[PDB]
Chain A
């Protein structure tokens, strides 16, 4: 936390120390996760060099978790929301474990909420256009068998269809069945689909989301 980016010449060995004492189910993960968060805040952009070595363990935490209420999964999810644009080349083997977390009907409800919210918040720095079919269907499955995860799943869906332009117009009749079956009203999803079906402009539809994020950051 004190040396921001000068820890690089001694960072690799640090990872070598974390891969040795990160056993699966003990009280040592609660501090390893905080160490990961602090390393992420320190490196800030160069973390992608040392992210792969910590990817297996994370996966073994997502499936082999026997914590009361799945609180280690929640801490790991809150630690993942800090990665930002670092998990750009590694979103392919780290997203499926999270999409498998909120569509499982036996997982605790707060863990599913945490997964939905981290998927919702990870779209403010990443391009989620390619991984559209892997997210649209688990969400419409979470919407018809979970009467309490409706609002958070709708927020995630609205944040996802904001990046997709007219590329989402093919899914509208598929989601509308579930939306009218349970009388699901969301005010931002209605806005987005109204601007998708009926045109708003021509330059605003089918736009790179990173371009929009950059032009709104300035």
Chain B
């Protein structure tokens, strides 16, 4: 039949008091309603994947898609909150969290939010790079965009944006936030997959701007329309920002790539006074109690341009360097013992990386400290890998403490040309070549394959080729 058979599946939404079975148990009346909602949603999002359903639901007559938009413009906070989920999973968009403030639900739809696949055990860096880094294809058709553009055009033709605006203004906050986010996502998709004629007048939003600029309507509607416009602009800024590296290995990889691309094709002095003041207020030399130092000041005294332990021969600076070295060494059991999810854990790792690079910045005065640090790192790695007969099993500390970030130090040390020379002076590359052979620890190969740098030819590519050719099947697959 014409308009009575297929359109039955969207009766639970269009009929506010829908009774499917004539004789049902009166005890279950809300669970039955939720089951009806779920089944109707699963059927509606399944008729929009076939052409015979798209064409038959969007017919130019009194179709079943206009009855779905019309009931969205009715202030019924039960049907209105359930139609938004169908609109969200029709366009394959991620759902925000159920909140009342826009700034908390905007953070939950961040393309760069942490996922369970990005953990070291699951998908350490390869799965994370897939999400944040874009595909290499810039002219492939990508039929998914074709389908989404057709669906979005069919929905805009029947007045979906006006309905979304009416939901944004005249509704609760729990639903206003979700409708604002859906409108932002649809407006971003428009200027990306729609032809110019279809999307050159959508960004005007006349029904919302005329409401946000009319001083005759009640002031509540005007103010909520202005707030909706502000939230739309904030969402657009978030969209044009982009996904950012969540982890610290991918961050270093991308930064090294950008630096290579920048340097392939081509500040304050702080002589003696400001240096000493910053060294004083850091609190490193006053007391040796850790976790109470001023780490921002340490970072800026390590990262300042011309402070490199080679032009400022001060005994206080050497005391500072020796204290930080003794703190960062794994044998001292001070930094290598703090657990993950620590309050300040990323900052300590960043400071350690820039410190082991600042030691390298002095090619003639920074040997006694850098060699000691890297030799202690090699000792710890040979002890934890299984090259000793004491325990040969220390995965319970590497996986749960900050002692796994000692691969980031070797990573940021292997990028520079003078860095690989120092790295080879000690038995570092031989240690990794030996570690590549074992069969019991697969996380160490993940850590060493995603930390080293392969920009220039040398001993860093030999380890990669050895892992790629002769290693455990899972480690070989990750490599």
Contacts and interface: CB of A to CB of B under 8 A. Distances in A.
B246 A203 contact: yes
A56 interface: no
Contacts of A89: 223, 226-227, 230
B189 to A, nearest CB: 21
Nearest to A188: B296
A202 B254 contact: yes
Contacts of A25: none
A201 B296 contact: no
B251 interface: yes
A206 B251 CA distance: 15
Interface stretch (A115-123, A136-144, A191-199): A191-199
B308 to A, nearest CB: 13
A66 B174 CA distance: 48
Most chain-A CB neighbours within 10 Å: which of B300, B346, B350?
B300
A107 B422 CA distance: 62
B350 A208 contact: no
Interface string B265-293: 00110000010011001000000000000
A211 B230 contact: no
A145 interface: no
B219 interface: yes
B357 to A, nearest CB: 11
Given A49-B220, A191-B297, A199 B304 contact: no
A88 B103 contact: no
A190 B300 contact: yes
A176 B223 CA distance: 42
B268 A88 contact: no
Given A185-B274, A191-B296, A203-B244, A176 B112 contact: no
A50 to B, nearest CB: 8
Interface string B34-58: 0000000000000000000000000
Interface string A109-133: 0000000000000000000000000
A194 B244 contact: no
A21 interface: no
B271 to A, nearest CB: 13
B172 interface: no
Interface string A207-218: 110110011000
Contacts of B106: 211
Contact of A185 (B277, B299, B350): B277
Contacts of A202: 244-245, 251, 254-255
Interface residues of A, number: 26
A49 B223 contact: yes
A31 B346 CA distance: 50
B107 interface: yes
Interface string A70-98: 00000000000000000011000000000
Contacts of A26: none
Contacts of A195: 299-300, 303
Interface string B241-261: 100111010010011000000
Given A88-B230, A187-B281, A203-B244, A214 B107 contact: yes
A203 B113 CA distance: 11
B103 A210 contact: yes
A2 interface: no
A214 B108 CA distance: 12
Nearest to B110: A211
A207 B112 CA distance: 13
Nearest to B248: A201
A129 B277 CA distance: 31
Interface string A166-198: 000000000010001000010100110011011
Contacts of B234: 208, 210
Contact of B299 (A187, A194, A203): A194
A210 B274 CA distance: 33
Contacts of B251: 201-203
- Which of A88, A201, A210 is packed against the most chain B CB atoms within 10 Å? A201
Contacts of A201: 248, 251, 346, 350
A206 B240 CA distance: 11
Contact of A176 (B268, B346, B350): B268
B237 interface: yes
Contact of A215 (B107, B219, B244, B268): B107
Nearest to B301: A194
A100 interface: no
B303 A198 contact: yes
B372 interface: no
A195 B251 CA distance: 16
A89 B246 CA distance: 33
B107 A49 contact: no
User: 9 closest A-B pairs (Cβ-Cβ)?
Assistant: A203-B244, A194-B300, A191-B300, A191-B296, A198-B303, A214-B103, A89-B226, A202-B251, A210-B103
11 contacts: A176-B268, A185-B277, A191-B297, A191-B299, A194-B300, A198-B303, A203-B112, A208-B237, A214-B103, A214-B104, A214-B107
Interface of A: 48-49, 88-89, 176, 180, 185, 187, 190-191, 194-195, 197-203, 206-208, 210-211, 214-215
Interface of B: 101, 103-104, 106-107, 112, 219-220, 223, 226-227, 230, 234, 237-238, 241, 244-246, 248, 251, 254-255, 267-268, 274, 277-278, 281, 296-297, 299-300, 303-304, 346, 350
Given A203-B251, A208-B238, 14 more contacts: A88-B227, A88-B230, A89-B226, A191-B299, A203-B112, A203-B245, A206-B241, A207-B241, A208-B241, A211-B106, A214-B101, A214-B104, A214-B107, A215-B107
